[PDB]
Structure 1
Amino acid sequence: SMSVKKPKRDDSKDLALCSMILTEMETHEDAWPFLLPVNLKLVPGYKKVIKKPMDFSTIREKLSSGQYPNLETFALDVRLVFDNCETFNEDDSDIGRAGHNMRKYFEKKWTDTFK
């Protein structure tokens, strides 16, 4: 509260570390469904159904231009990618399996880096 602060957790490496994690996700073999925005003119249903589209290129641009205020807003966008994937794709499809694999991969790197 006013004039009463918890000790300062060091955040000065967060930008660099989220960049490294994102590089590892970009280069995973199962990243292909997630590298670019879904083409809303060509994929029926996507526009109306998925209220907040997100993809790795969009996260990389946001990261590069100071649009994440902290590491939690970064994690929120990454999880949005996989949450959208589960909403639109059956678990037993190549893209559905890709999404589960990528979420698992992400969440381990996240815990190992920060927790």
Structure 2
Amino acid sequence: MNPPPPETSNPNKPKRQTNQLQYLLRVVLKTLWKHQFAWPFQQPVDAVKLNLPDYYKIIKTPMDMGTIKKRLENNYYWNAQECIQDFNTMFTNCYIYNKPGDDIVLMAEALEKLFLQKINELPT
């Protein structure tokens, strides 16, 4: 019931490093990672472990911060916007799979606010 986790490397896809991407790893991701509500989002959802047998029946573009971290470490992204889209997909997936007011959704909401605070201004 678990598909393979999202790719963190792809030899068909060009790599890049930018000041913004470096910041996304060093500052944004590594700070969000330490937040008290980061733990549900540090790895791909394991539907067997977590007893969420419909997770991947609902969520067709899964994403998590562990994957994002590995992508940043591997220079998988072309630019910061591509990485930002992955965070936004992670947050949106949470709102889609769950319901307003759920504890997991309150966690995602808090992390998304902090994320927006940190990406409001990126290095030039």
After TM superposition, the score normalised by the length of structure 1 is 0.84
Q: Identity over the aligned pairs, expressed in percent?
A: 30
Structure 2 gaps of 5+ residues are: 1-16
Which deviates the most, 47-56 or 11-20?
11-20
Of the candidates 27, 38, 42, which is equivalent to residue 35 of structure 1?
42
Cα distance in structure 2, aligned partners of 1:105 and 1:15: 17
Higher helix share: 1
**Pair 1:57-2:63 in alignment:** no
- Counterparts of 1:1-115 in structure 2 under 5 Å? 12-19=18-25, 20-41=27-48, 42-113=51-122
Describe the shift of the 1:71–1:49 C-alpha distance in structure 2 as closer, same or farther (beyond 3 A): same
CA RMSD of aligned residues (A): 1.7
Larger Rg: 1
Describe the shift of the 1:65–1:91 C-alpha distance in structure 2 as closer, same or farther (beyond 3 A): same
After TM superposition, the score normalised by the length of structure 2 is 0.78
Larger RCO: 1 or 2 (CA < 8 Å, sep 6+): 2
Contact conserved, 2:62 with 2:93, CA < 8 A, in 1? yes
Structure 1 gaps of 5+ residues are: 1-10
Cα distance in structure 1, aligned partners of 2:81 and 2:54: 30
